[PDB]
Amino acid sequence: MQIGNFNTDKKVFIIAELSANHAGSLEMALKSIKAAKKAGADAIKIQTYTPDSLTLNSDKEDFIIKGGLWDKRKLYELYESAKTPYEWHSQIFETAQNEGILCFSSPFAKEDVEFLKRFDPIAYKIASFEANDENFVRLIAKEKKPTIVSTGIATEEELFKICEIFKEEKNPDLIFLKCTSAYPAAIEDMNLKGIVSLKEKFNVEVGLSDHSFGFLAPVMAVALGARVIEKHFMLDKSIESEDSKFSLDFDEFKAMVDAVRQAESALGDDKLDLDEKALKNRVFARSLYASKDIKKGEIFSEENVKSVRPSFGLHPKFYQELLGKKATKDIKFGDALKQGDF
Amino acid sequence: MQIGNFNTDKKVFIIAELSANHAGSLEMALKSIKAAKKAGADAIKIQTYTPDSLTLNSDKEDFIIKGGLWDKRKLYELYESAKTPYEWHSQIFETAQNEGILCFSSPFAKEDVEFLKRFDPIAYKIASFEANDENFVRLIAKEKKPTIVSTGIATEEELFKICEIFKEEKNPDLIFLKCTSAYPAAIEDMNLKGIVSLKEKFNVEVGLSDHSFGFLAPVMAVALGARVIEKHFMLKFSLDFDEFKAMVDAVRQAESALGDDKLDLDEKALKNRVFARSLYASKDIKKGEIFSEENVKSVRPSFGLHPKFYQELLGKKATKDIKFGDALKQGDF
Ligand SMILES: [Mn+2]
Ligand SMILES: [Mn+2]
């Protein structure tokens, strides 16, 4: 299957999430896009929403944040500061095109999709929190583009309902991501084998949305069959934002890309053919040799035939058939047995 | 599957290959066994052979080594110096029990197996070079013990014959290892996907014999389904105590991060579902007003109606006065 011009069955699709790590600056946003391409990412993912896309402008208990940096402010106000403006989208997509990196966005409402259609995005991203919204999922499926869905909070019934919707809307490019929580979350809670379970149960392509640090999660995801890797990206390590705690800077993201690319090539082939190095080591494989001198007409036995290294003699499969036959030639001790010697 | 007292379906069986890294001194060998437990290995594997077990005492071209440290010497001479003497096995096995680590050996001839039977080994190891010897494989398979086999040089036909032999001799504990060559071997040449193919084609347990440095091969092997990791240990391609301990911790890190296939929501996943989408009143709604896009909005948090009701809810009438920002519930329509 293909995302834009990218074959995800040949290379792992590494996505750098621009997220809110532009810190409200278009200059930092454009600087981050070219650096993600320099880091080795294949696509940049921005978030397209307005506060109306996400929540309600209300003073009620449900809509005020508890305990965070916004310990008593509104959800509408939080999403306002972290929003990626519509005004930047023209420059963001064009800057990604100039740098050669792919670009797509994560919408959060119907209005964001209608705005995104003017860019004709190669793919769509459904965040974990919007996965249980069938009407939103159906609206994105009608776009007939590869859709990546985060399964962080979705139940199996909801994941099954997502599949039926994509089959209903005749959209075959559905990808499911396993989510890993950000530290101090423990490694035991990663459950990276859910990548395999997601592929088997729902017959979709699978990937990893990694909010953890290090190489354990992305490197194992490649081995587990994940073909899309998503990591949050920020240009600077002092660029404080709403996601700077679990994001990667240019150095760590480039290092993660190299770790994932090494895993890809180290996955190699299923074929059990003997490589050039394996054939060089097969010289010292077991083979049948003469463990004593054998005159013509003498019969072969355990006493004059021995399975030894190197492999220049008869293959050890001949041992039972060879035993009891008569030598056709004079065989000195240490001679490699050949066909015709018996 | 159980190897001795080790249950291989719960934990990855990490084997430290002592090989000839004792340098011909029993004092160094016993120190290596004590370090394997500190590194986190579950078993140490020694080699049981005499030069007769491997090759012939001959000066002919076939039996002289080319290009190594033994650039023109005999194969018989190399195996004589690198041998693990039979006299050491008793102390080696007794040291393994005292340190709490498992111990088994790699035989290379019939005579070596009969010597090992006095120790009742939990498992046997067939080196790659002996994998094409069906008479040797049949002899080891008849021991009815878990047998780990290196597929480094074995052909597909030979691997099938090993399975047929183990099926013939009714020994079901057959394990195949994928081999990775040592430096200068490239990462591209690893072909670690053969771990899965070995499991699929031959219906055996799979493992990794790693001669490479780093964590790429062992950590990926855990993800690929390997339940045996084999590494050479020394107190050129071996690992010291620090490198082996670092690899063991890396392998155990991979195990815990593998987790479950189960897709149930964990405690952390349930905490984040609070911020899932739900149906709320996006305007004030008087009793008897019909619901529409203008007065119903799917938003965060999740305290309102589940978004599945959006199609059914649209067009129905409110049964009560609903204010803006109110979570929609069953009975509001
Ligand atoms: Mn994320
Ligand atoms: Mn080895």
Describe the structure.
- By secondary structure, chain A is α/β, with parallel strands linked by helices.
- Chain A has two domains: 1-272, no CATH class; 273-342, no CATH class.
- The first copy, chain A, contains twelve helices and twelve strands.
- Chain A has an eight-stranded parallel β-sheet with strand order 5-4-3-10-9-8-7-6. Chain A has a two-stranded antiparallel ribbon with strand order 1-2. The first copy, chain A, has a two-stranded antiparallel sheet with strand order 11-12.
- In chain A, helix 6 runs parallel beside helix 7.
- The two termini of chain A are 58 Å apart.
- At the A-B interface, helix 6, helix 8, helix 9, helix 10 and helix 11 of A face helix 6, helix 7, helix 8, helix 9 and helix 10 of B.
- The structure holds manganese (II) ion (MN) (2 copies).
- The PDB classes it as biosynthetic protein.
